[PDB]
Amino acid sequence: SREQIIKDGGNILVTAGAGSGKTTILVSKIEADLKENKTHYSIAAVTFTNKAAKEIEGRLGYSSRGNFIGTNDGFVESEIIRPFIKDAFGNDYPDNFTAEYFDNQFASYDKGLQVLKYQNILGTYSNPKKNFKFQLALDILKKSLVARQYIFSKYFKIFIDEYQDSDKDMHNLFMYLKDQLKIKLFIVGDPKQSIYIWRGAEPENFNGLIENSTDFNKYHLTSNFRCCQDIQNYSNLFNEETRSLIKEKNEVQNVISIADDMPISDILLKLTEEKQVLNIEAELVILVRRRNQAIEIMKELNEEGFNFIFIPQTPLDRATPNATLLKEVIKYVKNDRYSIYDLAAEIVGNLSSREIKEIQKIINELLVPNINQVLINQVLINLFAKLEITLDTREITAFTEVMMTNEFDIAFDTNEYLHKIFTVHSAKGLEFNQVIITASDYNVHYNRDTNEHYVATTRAKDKLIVIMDNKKYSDYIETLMKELKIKNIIKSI
């Protein structure tokens, strides 16, 4: 498992999925290797977005080892291109160059050298599949002897995040550091095609390393690593592929089942005061299938003194290529404390201060109120035109609808609330500490809602409370408990 992962000191290839399993293990693996190694060598972690680089830097702590934590583009720029470009190509080339991602697309590698030599800027390649900065960095290393000496002397291992999005030119540099410079590589990626890719992503180079590489040591990560063992056993029994991984335990305490005989508010009081299996001071969230089921529970609790705020699923809450970025644009529009730098951190690459000012100009048109649906669509196209990303028609309408109304404001609110209620689709992504669900929502016999039920069960982190509303739900438990000869998988009050 994870203990076997961190012990390996060689080239490690990690398959990460379900989210957050990659980030926590990455930070723990980095800080553990820093404690083992006392020599002068440092580590280098590279992330596509600037937020992930800042997220890793905050958890690691002091970087007195000289460790580099930053963007993929910022790494090759500050460590390879800028220091040794004059050594590789002569004194004609500048080291005070400014890289602009959006401007100055060129057709050939020879053309881009002239933009850097004469126009004093570092422009991107026109083809999204070919990266000019990494082609330049790899070229500089082969031309410059000092460049190869410095990289070997500075870093002994390099950590790479989200490797499935790396392009071929970006992939060539990483393999060049491992094959020629003999630098250890810790690779984290998602083998599934998924929904999120960098504009020049090719999953085959990552998939090819899993199939034909003898140097790397392959590992895998559990999807529900953060969930406790008792919650994992209750979640995995509903899907046939997941039933094999769980192991039975002599005593089960985290998953509680209680039949709904008293009103909904009384069940909440019973679990909080009579058995104290749920703490009122800990965050508590309740699961529903539809928005109406959440409203009636929220209104029933306001009468009993319980205070709650309910997050609804927005039109943007849909598996689309630009869903993650579109939500961040909404968070910058809705919230005043959300800085433009926080929005730029979500954008791939380390944008310059001048490029940030141009993107800020496009979005400032959305900060004026009551300017109708047509202008919101053009600002959105103008925004994504600079990023060279086309926008889905339903993604545009979903973005527009959220901008018009204040209905989905708290779903993108920066503030955090202790007690909430969310829909199964509302928080498909984020995870909660303790969750209560009801059985009548999910049809378990024909597996229509088993995927929504599996998501519902995996959201809870410490304690999961299940209400046995449906007899067919309880029958599917008792039937499969006999197939697997499981005496206890649930704790009933």
Add this chain to the structure above:
Amino acid sequence: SREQIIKDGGNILVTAGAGSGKTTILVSKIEADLKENKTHYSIAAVTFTNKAAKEIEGRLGYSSRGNFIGTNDGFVESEIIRPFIKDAFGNDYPDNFTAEYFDNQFASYDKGLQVLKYQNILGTYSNPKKNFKFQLALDILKKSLVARQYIFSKYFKIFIDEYQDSDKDMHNLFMYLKDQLKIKLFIVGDPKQSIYIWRGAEPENFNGLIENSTDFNKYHLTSNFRCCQDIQNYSNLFNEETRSLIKEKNEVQNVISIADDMPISDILLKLTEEKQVLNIEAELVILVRRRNQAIEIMKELNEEGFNFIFIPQTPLDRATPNATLLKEVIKYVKNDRYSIYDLAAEIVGNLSSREIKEIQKIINELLVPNINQVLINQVLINLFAKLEITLDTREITAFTEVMMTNEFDIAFDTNEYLHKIFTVHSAKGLEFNQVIITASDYNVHYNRDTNEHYVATTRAKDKLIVIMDNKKYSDYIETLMKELKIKNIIKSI
């Protein structure tokens, strides 16, 4: 006189001529004002060529006052444009820009801003009469409040050398500092059209200040300021315009006349040992009209133990627009110790390191031996094409002829010799300490050689020795001594 010049603390306009009178007074005026002023304000001296700026910095000494000594282009770049361009035009414009003089000519002021904003370089104007850097610097001062505050706070007086070569845009900035910022200006220039002009020179702006400016205080400099009073009196009596300025002295000791009765070498021994009016340890130089007259004197002295090296006038020794620069190109080719940076210092403006490497590439073709007359002409055109200067046909042939032969090598030699012999045209420029001439060379009755004789007399600095070979020469002295009632103007041995 000069004592009246340095005492004035206001705006001073100086008319300088005959050479070297401008540089010595400029350094003395600067260091004297630094001693008078104890406050934090500094001075700023600007010269067109980098050699003149380095020449002033060496004589001044320590610049702990923060005084700026450099090029006109380097002044507006480091003090106005680079610090306050972002304040004047916004954060879009860079402060790490690189100015290239030869590349990126543009037609309109708006076009050059885009080259600086996007292409990150500072290019020159296509029209030689219009300067873009000074148009940019003046524009930045009007746009930026801090820029005006810094210039007033830093400098209380600004010294300007060779003002007749300043263009109109360069002239507008200097007047803007005097009229708006109320900064004292010490201006040195030559009112005569002369032979040497910067490619965008307009003498009218300098001439216009002499005619219509009430703020400036006009002054004049003597042509033979370095020569002693006795030598000045002997030189000025031959030309009618010059006879009025000299004043008689009761005793004359510097100008010696001796009739040539003994051989030439014996006259040299007689003056050195019998009267000791010439020191063998001091530099001694003899004047002739033709090259044959110098050879026979040089050969006659080698027999008597006297050792001499004779500098001949080169084909480049001719009043042409590019004579000064062409000689420096020869000095870089002939001498190995003469650095390429010394050649770049003679070029107008502060050339960048990359621009220096391109000029060095063009001249390196002349360093190979025996490559005939045709290739020398093309390298010369290629050299001056970068400087945007056309070359006279006779200037090209004069440059070529010197390159072929080693005959004129010592005339451009970096080494310096104590005892020499030079032609009247050989050292029309440089001045010598003690000079001996002969009377038979100059026809004084019809004033054919009075200009060459006046040059001959003005070369000597401390002691001048005249040989009375011609009776017509001595008669013209005695005749004019009676017209002016001068009892003594010459010391006869």
